[PDB]
């Protein structure tokens, strides 16, 4: 009697999408396509403003050591304010979710791309995917923006780490995460398509479109570009393989591509992503992406919507402007300066989303899934992931050398040492907890030290010393050393060290170390760094990336419970004044080629 079409789960998603749409304000409409920051969100602004979308920025968390039950709790709130609007639009909530839950404190903290681009596993990754959307669920949150399919052509790029391979074809495999977070398209599936499963699985997001990973001194990161096959050959593959496997979301890049920047490319966003690649889900910008359409940025904000919406974007990660961003659009649209066919198409695409995923029908959390976030299964997924990320680059320093790996697990005294040995916060690296890494035991997790001190017969004495001079490991009485050392978290424009040569103590440390006892030298780094000093003292030695939460993944691989089977994934400069110099360049003279990996067998 009161039946309206839009709220009828058995209809087809075209229809509840025609019939929502059909019945919406442009309030209503703008409404949709507005992102805020939960910093800014209250119920009478969600309500008030008929907002479709919410988001965690990088560290924005309801309190320090919130539970499960807290952000969903927060999430339901936020949730309940925008299904008492009029029409009853439930929200999506999204979060850089981008190696596991990574804001959330107890969350499993899953390797970073670069190590998973090591492990040329595309299974692993798509399991990652789905255990990083039951974890995303546990919160309440629906939409995860990752996977990064960035195409790191310089390692001096702080979000080098983000990309899975300065290799496209690697990247491309990687795609898989995406199935893994949303679930397995249907057997007849479009091209272009979004998908979503259910309530168990979330919305991705492809970013950043296109040509993030692009070179200028570090990819670093405001016109990061090259030209017409650069584009069709290195950046752009993945997206169509993105297309493929149904991704809800992309994300637009803050870069430019013949100078254009990304956030007013019409001919890239609408000519090429939707109407080529048949793109039906939304766009979204990156944060504050249109106000740095101008220079400085924010100087033309009108200009700034004007231009991003006409361009193709969906949706607009404001985040905290929104009230500029409301009237300034509407204003626009009143004036017919932004027709109304432009919003009706952005509108559409976010409800397509959100009716295809199941969100009309689960606007609220499963408290039952509370119990998914840190679940030790998923952990165990990650200590795999590590593991297998681990590539070995020295086991042993001369050709008649016993290899030092794997190391026996009896021993009578054992020296653990390095900056990197215990502390959490270095070995998940950037974009955890978050407004950026941290230092030391930041979440639930296993540091290398513990990791040891939890694989060795209880025999072994374990001896843990942070940064120890050369006598005491002459003296110590060890049978050999473990030596931690590496980066600092870091990204774009934050602690990014472009010369890549590791803080000290670092190497000062590896050569006290090395020079009183047999040393396996575990590498914690975002990318290829000045090696050559480390190697010359160690007797083995491991690239273990940025490994996340689960340490024992090294220490799986050092005590030989299985062996060595990651690959480089990006090339191993022999000094930075090569770079950029990636696989296929004209002078390619790598200390190691992309690929290089030695093996151990399991004992």
Request: aromatic share 8%; hydrophobic share 40%; glycine share 10%.
């Amino acid at each position: 009697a009161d039946y309206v079409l839009y709220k009828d789960a058995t209809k087809p998603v075209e229809d509840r999408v025609a019939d929502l749409l059909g019945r919406m304000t442009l309030a209503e409409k703008i409404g949709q396509m507005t992102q805020i920051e939960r910093l800014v969100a209250t119920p009478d602004v969600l309500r008030d403003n008929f907002i479709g979308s919410l988001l965690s920025g990088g560290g924005s968390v309801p309190r320090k050591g919130a539970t499960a039950k807290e952000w969903q709790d927060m999430v339901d709130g936020f949730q309940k304010a925008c299904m008492s609007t009029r029409l009853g639009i439930p929200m999506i909530y999204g979060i850089d979710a981008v190696h596991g839950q990574n804001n959330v404190y107890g969350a499993t903290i899953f390797p970073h791309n670069v190590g998973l681009g090591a492990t040329r596993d595309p299974y692993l990754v798509k399991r990652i995917g789905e255990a990083t959307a039951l974890e995303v669920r546990a919160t309440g949150i629906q939409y995860a923006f990752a996977p990064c399919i960035a195409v790191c052509r310089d390692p001096r790029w702080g979000r080098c780490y983000e990309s899975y391979s300065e290799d496209r074809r690697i990247v491309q495999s990687m795609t898989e995460l995406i199935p893994g977070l949303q679930g397995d398209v249907p057997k007849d599936f479009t091209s272009g398509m979004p998908f979503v499963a259910g309530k168990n699985k979330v919305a991705a997001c492809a970013k950043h479109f296109v040509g993030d990973g692009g070179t200028v001194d570090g990819i670093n990161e405001n016109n990061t570009i090259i030209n017409r096959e650069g584009l069709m050959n290195i950046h752009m593959p993945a997206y169509k393989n993105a297309m493929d496997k149904g991704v809800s979301t992309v994300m637009i890049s803050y870069s430019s591509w013949n100078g254009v920047k990304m956030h007013a490319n019409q001919d890239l966003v609408t000519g090429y992503l939707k109407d080529t690649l048949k793109f039906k889900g939304f766009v979204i910008s990156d944060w504050e992406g249109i106000d740095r359409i101008t220079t400085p940025a924010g100087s033309d904000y009108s200009y700034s919507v004007k231009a991003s919406i006409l361009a193709g974007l969906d949706m607009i990660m404001v985040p905290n402007k929104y009230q500029q961003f409301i009237s300034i659009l509407t204003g626009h649209v009143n004036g017919g300066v932004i027709p109304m066919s432009r919003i009706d198409d952005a509108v559409t695409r976010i409800l397509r989303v959100k009716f295809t995923m199941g969100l009309f029908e689960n606007p609220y959390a499963d408290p039952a899934m509370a119990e998914q976030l840190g679940k030790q299964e998923h952990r165990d997924l990650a200590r795999e992931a590590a593991r297998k990320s681990l590539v070995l680059l020295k086991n042993g320093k001369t050709s008649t050398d016993a290899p030092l790996l794997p190391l026996p697990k009896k021993a009578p005294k054992i020296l653990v040492a390095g900056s990197h040995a215990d502390n959490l916060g270095y070995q998940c690296g950037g974009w955890t907890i978050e407004h950026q890494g941290d230092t030391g035991r930041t979440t639930v997790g296993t540091t290398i030290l513990e990791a040891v001190k939890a694989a060795v017969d209880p025999s072994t004495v374990v001896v843990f010393a942070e940064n120890p001079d050369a006598e005491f490991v002459k003296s110590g009485g060890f049978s050999y050393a473990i030596v931690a050392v590496g980066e600092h978290p870091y990204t774009e424009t934050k602690g990014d060290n472009l010369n890549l040569t590791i803080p000290e103590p670092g190497l000062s440390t590896v050569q006290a170390v090395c020079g009183g006892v047999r040393c396996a030298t575990v590498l914690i780094s975002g990318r290829p760094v000045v090696v050559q000093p480390l190697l010359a003292a160690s007797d083995a030695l491991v690239a273990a990336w940025l490994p996340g939460s689960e340490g024992q993944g090294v220490t799986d691989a050092l005590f030989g419970d299985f062996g060595f089977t990651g690959r480089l994934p990006r090339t191993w400069f022999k000094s930075v004044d090569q770079l950029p110099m990636n696989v296929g360049d004209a002078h390619y003279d790598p200390l190691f080629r992309l690929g290089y990996g030695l093996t151990t067998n399991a004992t």
